[PDB]
């Protein structure tokens, strides 16, 4: 997918690898190389009014 990846404060568990949301979408992930809780978030979007 696409989005912004930032450092998250979600206290994941050693066996937990992903993280869902209300709409069954992945909010946070774990980098397989270095153990770190990321945060998947799309960039800015909205409506263009002329």
């Amino acid at each position: 997918g696409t989005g912004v990846l930032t450092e998250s404060n979600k206290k994941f568990l050693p066996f937990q690898q992903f993280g869902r949301d209300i709409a069954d979408t992945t909010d946070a992930v774990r980098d397989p190389q270095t153990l770190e809780i990321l945060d998947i978030t799309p960039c800015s979007f909205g409506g263009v009014s002329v």
Binding site: G1, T2, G3, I22, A23, T25, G47
Partner: protein, 425 residues
Amino acid sequence: TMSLGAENSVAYSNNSIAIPTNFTISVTTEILPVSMTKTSVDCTMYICGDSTECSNLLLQYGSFCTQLKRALTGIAVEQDKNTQEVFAQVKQIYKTPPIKYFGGFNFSQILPDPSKPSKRSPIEDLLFNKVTDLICAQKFKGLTVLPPLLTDEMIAQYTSALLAGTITSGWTFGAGPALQIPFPMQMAYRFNGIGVTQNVLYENQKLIANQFNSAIGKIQDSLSSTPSALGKLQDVVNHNAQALNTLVKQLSSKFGAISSVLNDIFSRLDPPEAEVQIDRLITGRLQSLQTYVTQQLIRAAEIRASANLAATKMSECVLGQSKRVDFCGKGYHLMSFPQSAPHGVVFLHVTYVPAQEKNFTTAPAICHDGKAHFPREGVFVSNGTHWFVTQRNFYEPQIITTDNTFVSGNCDVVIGIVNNTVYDP
């Protein structure tokens, strides 16, 4: 088994009448929704966001999202017009004079407080503090809340201008120019509008002022204690949430496909067989969004009907004195004061309620010299021995003279005629 009320047996006779001997100034409250939460969905991001393959396939399903966006824009414009047609009824913002002595009536609970940074009345503070993440977990999937045009400060200024015009001028600032008038005379006019004479107010001004102040003070306690008073507005805040969160829950449904994630379908299967798996999700999500829009249409229609009712009440109860029963309060409507609230308006109806009734002997007419004397404005009562004439809303016994009754024919065809002498000055 639920009770339908108490049991009252009003004694009905051909000769007795109940005349009220005192009165009460009751301030009731009425809550009316005006606007909703303007929401705007996204065409592609809700159906399939962060996916370039589905963005190309969604274009072959007609211009459904365009119609949905048009309907949402229409709903937003309608909710803005609903707020503009209720509070913005005057073209001149009035101001309260520095001296706040209006005869004895204390309006400190409804006038705006300049010390507070919100510039709202103490009642509006409780109204806004009792009507209350999910505002960021829904934005990332198209659900966007548009801010209203008229902010809370502008609605507060509109309500303050309406209150100033009602206190200083009365009902003259709604018809034409604002005509200044002392508040005791305005209250005397309000009393004359329902039948009570001006002397009843001018001789009991302190009692009426004390009753009005006590009712205004008890209104704050009633609104602060009971949490279900501001419910009709909270429902508008609740259902809208149920209209959004559920619309989010529809993104976790597979609609007969293998999964609810389009990335997992595009990565595993090839497009030739992923088309049929993506079409079910697209159709299901489009149908869910269409259902959301067609329900929000009915909700906006109901809210527009409520806003029209609130505007009619603002025009008939605040800008004047309506004689419609149970429209501007329960009883003899005296006046009304508007206040703002989150997506709603609160009308404080000041009403005249009779009390402490007493039983007297009545008669249709009297004749002194063989000619029936009918009351010009009032009713004939008796105290057991003498006959007096009093109005239909307050016991004020007066002698029967020639200027209080008119002659019409002889007293031979009327039923219930009693002989009594009249006075001639």
